[PDB]
Ligand binder design. Sequence first.
Ligand SMILES: Cc1cc2nc3c(=O)[nH]c(=O)nc-3n(C[C@H](O)[C@H](O)[C@H](O)COP(=O)(O)O)c2cc1C
Ligand SMILES: Cc1cc2nc3c(=O)[nH]c(=O)nc-3n(C[C@H](O)[C@H](O)[C@H](O)COP(=O)(O)O)c2cc1C
Lengths: 140, 140
Amino acid sequence: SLYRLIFSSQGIPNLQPQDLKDILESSQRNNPANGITGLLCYSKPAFLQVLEGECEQVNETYHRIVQDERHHSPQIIECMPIRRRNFEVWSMQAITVNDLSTEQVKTLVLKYSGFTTLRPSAMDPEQCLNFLLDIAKIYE
Amino acid sequence: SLYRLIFSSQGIPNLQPQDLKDILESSQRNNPANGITGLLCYSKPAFLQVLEGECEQVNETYHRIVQDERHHSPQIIECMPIRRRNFEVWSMQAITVNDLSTEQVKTLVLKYSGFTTLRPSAMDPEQCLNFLLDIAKIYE
Ligand SMILES: Cc1cc2nc3c(=O)[nH]c(=O)nc-3n(C[C@H](O)[C@H](O)[C@H](O)COP(=O)(O)O)c2cc1C
Ligand SMILES: Cc1cc2nc3c(=O)[nH]c(=O)nc-3n(C[C@H](O)[C@H](O)[C@H](O)COP(=O)(O)O)c2cc1C
């Protein structure tokens, strides 16, 4: 009943600043409640993110996520029953990747991937989550 | 880059043999090119799909299956990269299970479940793997 879901996506080519905080209000009004927790990451245009919570919640959310007019082509990287939550999960939070490339952050991309750019496309699930973890560290 | 995805959904109140013949002619047609192979399985109401391939046309197919309406509310029990394929024989293989099924199949259902009717959300990843495994193991 306690799952972890990983997957990445592609943000519609015309997405604006005022759209993402609206993705936030959502994640911060729709998750805490659901014992949905974890971390969402943006690197124009690449998306990554892990979900953790009740299996049925994890799912209730992901499939609700997929129809959003705001991006296309989502790749589940992992969905698996887990032993314990990793993010103490103050919230399903969001980080924009700058890109801004870089100050100690580009490094985190030769490490878990190759080039300086966020291609969740090279990542294996472990290098996938390993990364979502390392970034949050140096950040609150 | 290989990956395996296992999921189960709820059929609509009225799927007929005619309505079951239609999901398959679409996966021995699409999936061959699509590169999709696996067992599907159907004990009214639920289907219980296993799908095998690389990460892209997996999601491609699934997210498409979920766009389907013949069922509703899919759930991912497990997605992640594998060693080797287990369902390579059929580009898909439908297999109806029902209380009318042979007294044999009825008991393979019981070997992994707490009740005699196929119930996915009460079965862990291993249980479904082997069920589907042992159940294709015995279907030409
Ligand atoms: C990358 C991305 C991640 C999102 N994550 C969530 C989420 O975790 N929870 C959520 O409720 N909405 C999330 N959304 C937004 C939903 O698609 C949608 O806005 C939300 O379900 C609407 O909720 P509302 O009924 O409160 O307005 C996300 C959107 C994007 C683009
Ligand atoms: C439970 C279930 C599983 C399905 N699995 C597949 C599948 O593996 N591959 C596929 O192409 N269609 C699958 N479908 C049906 C697709 O939603 C749809 O029939 C297909 O994308 C249409 O293909 P067509 O345009 O060639 O007719 C499934 C449908 C259901 C209800």
